[PDB]
């Protein structure tokens, strides 16, 4: 797919994809292991209405 | 070549970057230091042969 711009010319590339879940049942297991980062800070806030 | 990834969302990935480094070295100059003496310089010439 081509695109025109005042700076330059684009080109898009797609391609089309397609997923099936083939297992009848659990094929699949998320482990979780180790934790790295309290992104949210635990101080005080405090909610003003 | 900045590596590039074709994300699962329809969203634009607007541009991609690929551009040109350029580094100015440095320089620096090293230093030594030789002297002679007074007599030395008539024995390896010959004025005092």
């Known amino acids: 797919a081509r695109h025109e711009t005042g700076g330059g010319v684009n080109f898009t590339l797609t391609q089309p994809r397609g997923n099936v879940d083939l297992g009848v049942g659990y094929t699949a297991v998320v482990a979780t292991a180790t934790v790295r980062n309290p992104v949210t800070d635990m101080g005080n806030l405090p909610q003003n209405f | ?49």
Do not use: C, V, W
Request: hydrophobic fraction near 45%; proline fraction near 8%.
């Open chain 2, 1 to 49: 070549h900045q590596p590039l990834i074709a994300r699962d969302g329809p969203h634009p990935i607007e541009q991609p970057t690929h551009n040109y480094m350029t580094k100015i070295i440095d320089r620096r100059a090293l230093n030594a230091a030789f002297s002679l003496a007074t007599e030395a310089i008539a024995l390896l010439t010959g004025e005092a042969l």
